[PDB]
Amino acid sequence: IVGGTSASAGDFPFIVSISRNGGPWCGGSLLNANTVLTAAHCVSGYAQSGFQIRAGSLSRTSGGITSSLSSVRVHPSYSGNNNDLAILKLSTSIPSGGNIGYARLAASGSDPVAGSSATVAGWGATSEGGSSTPVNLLKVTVPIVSRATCRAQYGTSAITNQMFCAGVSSGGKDSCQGDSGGPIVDSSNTLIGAVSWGNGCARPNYSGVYASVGALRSFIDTYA
């Protein structure tokens, strides 16, 4: 997270940190006791054994409840940067209560409205190319970018309706490497997306790009 602030206890009760090979890697959203929503590019093709989930902590290293993975279901038509979602099943159930809770998903058919305020959280880099990764969770608030504008930035082909964009035209607030898979929420704390991709981080004129929960509810509701 670039241009962000420290998250408070309880801000995102459903957020999970995903480590790989004991090192930081991605974030995710707890859908229910045995199910995590992340980015496909977090898990696709990699040894499943490498992954650990941690819930109910501001720290990616300590506290809360941990689980290994029993299974990985990548979106059947995950393709390049598109349909960048995966459902993870947990060997250890993660019950709700305390600072643990489950994500409220964006309505099927919904698409975040340009100009509306979104909040993204994670444990990734605090600048593009940065080598520090926070131990404690950060968050940042950014406006939704019109798909038309995002198409201008990236090309029409690059941006589908299974993606949306968020960021600030003068740059300096974004998700970054190590944030992928983690939650982007609306002003009501509804899960609208997962951190997916971008040209660098927080660049003026290159929005952060998110996998759209509203577009991909079929996939999610099936396997959740």
UniProtKB/Swiss-Prot annotation:
Cite the Peptidase S1 domain residue spans from the record: 1-224
Source superkingdom: Eukaryota
Q: Name one GO molecular function term.
A: serine-type endopeptidase activity
For this protein, the record's CDD domains field holds: Tryp_SPc (cd00190)
Q: Which SMART domains match?
A: Tryp_SPc
Which BP terms does GO give this entry? proteolysis
Q: What protein is this chain from? A: Trypsin
Species assigned in the record:
Fusarium oxysporum
The top of its lineage is: Eukaryota, Fungi, Dikarya, Ascomycota, Pezizomycotina
